Design an enzyme around this catalytic site. Structure first.
Site, PDB file in Angstrom:
ATOM      1  N   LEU A 152       0.824  -1.207   0.000  1.00 62.67           N
ATOM      2  CA  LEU A 152       0.000   0.000   0.000  1.00 62.67           C
ATOM      3  C   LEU A 152       0.857   1.256   0.000  1.00 62.67           C
ATOM      4  CD1 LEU A 152      -2.634  -0.972   2.666  1.00 62.67           C
ATOM      5  CD2 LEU A 152      -3.010  -0.885   0.181  1.00 62.67           C
ATOM      6  N   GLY A 153       1.865   1.262   0.866  1.00 66.38           N
ATOM      7  CA  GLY A 153       2.779   2.379   1.021  1.00 66.38           C
ATOM      8  C   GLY A 153       4.107   1.974   1.616  1.00 66.38           C
ATOM      9  N   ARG A 154       4.956   2.985   1.846  1.00 65.76           N
ATOM     10  CA  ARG A 154       6.285   2.858   2.421  1.00 65.76           C
ATOM     11  C   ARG A 154       6.606   4.152   3.163  1.00 65.76           C
ATOM     12  NH1 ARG A 154      11.310   0.130  -1.041  1.00 65.76           N
ATOM     13  NH2 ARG A 154      12.452  -0.703   0.760  1.00 65.76           N
ATOM     14  N   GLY A 155       6.715   4.041   4.481  1.00 64.75           N
ATOM     15  CA  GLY A 155       7.056   5.153   5.361  1.00 64.75           C
ATOM     16  C   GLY A 155       8.553   5.287   5.590  1.00 64.75           C
ATOM     17  N   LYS A 156       8.932   6.132   6.578  1.00 63.31           N
ATOM     18  CA  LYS A 156      10.321   6.412   6.954  1.00 63.31           C
ATOM     19  C   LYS A 156      11.046   5.144   7.437  1.00 63.31           C
ATOM     20  CE  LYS A 156      12.907  10.358   8.813  1.00 63.31           C
ATOM     21  NZ  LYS A 156      12.802  11.623   9.583  1.00 63.31           N
ATOM     22  N   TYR A 157      10.421   4.408   8.378  1.00 61.68           N
ATOM     23  CA  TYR A 157      10.977   3.169   8.935  1.00 61.68           C
ATOM     24  C   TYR A 157       9.949   2.013   8.915  1.00 61.68           C
ATOM     25  CZ  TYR A 157      14.784   6.248  10.611  1.00 61.68           C
ATOM     26  OH  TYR A 157      15.821   7.145  10.701  1.00 61.68           O
ATOM     27  N   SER A 158       9.037   2.030   7.921  1.00 60.74           N
ATOM     28  CA  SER A 158       7.984   1.032   7.779  1.00 60.74           C
ATOM     29  C   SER A 158       7.552   0.751   6.324  1.00 60.74           C
ATOM     30  CB  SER A 158       6.779   1.454   8.610  1.00 60.74           C
ATOM     31  OG  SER A 158       6.214   2.657   8.118  1.00 60.74           O
ATOM     32  N   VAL A 207       4.090  -0.906   4.332  1.00 62.09           N
ATOM     33  CA  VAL A 207       2.683  -1.180   4.632  1.00 62.09           C
ATOM     34  C   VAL A 207       2.036  -2.060   3.579  1.00 62.09           C
ATOM     35  CG1 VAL A 207       0.410  -0.117   5.034  1.00 62.09           C
ATOM     36  CG2 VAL A 207       2.447   0.819   6.150  1.00 62.09           C
ATOM     37  N   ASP A 222       2.408  14.146  15.333  1.00 62.40           N
ATOM     38  CA  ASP A 222       2.631  13.975  13.905  1.00 62.40           C
ATOM     39  C   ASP A 222       1.319  14.158  13.143  1.00 62.40           C
ATOM     40  OD1 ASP A 222       4.235  13.798  11.592  1.00 62.40           O
ATOM     41  OD2 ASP A 222       4.429  11.593  11.680  1.00 62.40           O
TER      42      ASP A 222
END
Ligand SMILES: Nc1ncnc2c1ncn2[C@@H]1O[C@H](COP(=O)(O)OP(=O)(O)OP(=O)(O)O)[C@@H](O)[C@H]1O
Ligand SMILES: CC(C)c1ccccc1-c1ccc(C[NH3+])cc1Cl
Length: 325
Positions: free
Chosen positions: A43-49, A51, A154
């Site tokens: 679905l996504g890609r965060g800073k340190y994750s 998904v 945040d």
């Protein structure tokens, strides 16, 4: 040194609870069965994750799996404890399970799935009532987590999931959230650049729940004026200059004097002198349909340098802007 400050609301909620509530380092994490989940798609890609959309094979329920890069164990424990404390709160994302990847020792948080639509795609169908409606839903979530002695730290559009079809909102990504303890000096390297409060930018460490109310103000300003982000800084210093270009430099210097803040020397080179702008100056033909005197009065009461002077989430809920909800 700097003048001390404390929250106007929910000041001592953690002082009166047992240590178990807020002592996240002592929290015992228990893993679910990673085999209960089958990954569907990214679905996504965060800073340190990373998904993933997944399905719970034991009940055919669609869930979201947030695979965490184990860079800091203490941070993971903090997010888990907070999600556990807030579980079932109004418009708070539900943590459904916590699991591990045996071979790589990778922790993963499992959440209820929200059929989200991005800000840019959402704006065109959003009416004035809809903005009031969703803003109130965010406020219920913030008044709830603040009442629970937690600062989100945040608040931004990417951390607000909206299923418009079901008029369902969820406040997500609690990885930067922290317990409020009066007198505590916090790390200012929190929130995302565009949403960082003036307290963060001037390195005033004794901040509180009011930080989230600044971020909420930044969100409201970008919606009603269709200027995303509203304060477009290119670095953390420049971010304060972009705020000063709107709120003016006079009230900024009054703020740093009030709390005896030692302003970094770099600011003299870039801050300059700026008048306080009227909010009506940002109204144009493209954005006027979401603007009203109530909306501007409300924005004016959130976007204040002085963190003590901002509306609390409960005061915000009582504003005339929400009489229609
Ligand atoms: N329940 C959810 N439904 C959809 N996307 C989600 C959900 N929770 C987190 N995300 C996504 O993963 C990231 C979370 O941090 C964001 O990029 C967000 O879009
Ligand atoms: C209406 C809504 C509370 C809002 C107000 C101000 C700025 C942005 C947004 C917003 C937040 C998240 C998402 C979906 N991720 C979409 C939108 Cl439109």
């Amino acid at each position: 040194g700097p003048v001390p400050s404390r929250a106007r609301v929910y000041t001592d909620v953690n002082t009166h609870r047992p240590s178990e509530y807020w002592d996240y380092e002592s929290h015992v994490v228990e893993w679910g069965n990673q085999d209960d989940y089958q990954l569907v798609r990214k679905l996504g890609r965060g800073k340190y994750s990373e998904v993933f959309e997944a399905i719970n094979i034991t009940n055919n329920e669609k869930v979201v799996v947030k695979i965490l890069k184990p860079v800091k164990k203490k941070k993971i424990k903090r997010e888990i404890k907070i999600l556990e404390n807030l579980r079932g709160g109004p418009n708070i994302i539900t943590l459904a399970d916590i699991v591990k990847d045996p071979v790589s020792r990778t922790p993963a948080l499992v959440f209820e799935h929200v059929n989200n639509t991005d800000f840019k795609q959402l704006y065109q169908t959003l009416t004035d009532y809809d903005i009031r409606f969703y803003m109130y839903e965010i406020l219920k979530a913030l008044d709830y987590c603040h009442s629970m002695g937690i600062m989100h730290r945040d608040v931004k559009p990417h951390n607000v999931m909206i299923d418009h079809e079901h008029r369902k909102l969820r406040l997500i990504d609690w990885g930067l959230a922290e317990f409020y303890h009066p007198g505590q000096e916090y790390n200012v390297r929190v929130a995302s650049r565009y949403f960082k409060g003036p307290e963060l930018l001037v390195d005033y460490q004794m901040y509180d729940y009011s930080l989230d109310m600044w971020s909420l103000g930044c969100m409201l300003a970008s919606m009603i004026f269709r200027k995303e982000p509203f304060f477009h800084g290119h670095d953390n210093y420049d971010q304060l200059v972009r705020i000063a270009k709107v709120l003016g430099t006079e009230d900024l210097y009054d703020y740093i004097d009030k709390y005896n803040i030692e302003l970094d020397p770099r600011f003299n080179d870039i801050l300059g002198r700026h008048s306080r702008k009227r909010w009506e100056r940002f109204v144009h033909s493209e954005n006027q349909h979401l603007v009203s005197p109530e909306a501007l009065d409300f924005l004016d009461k959130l976007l204040r340098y002085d963190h003590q002077s901002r509306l609390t989430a409960r005061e915000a809920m009582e504003h005339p802007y929400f009489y229609t909800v």
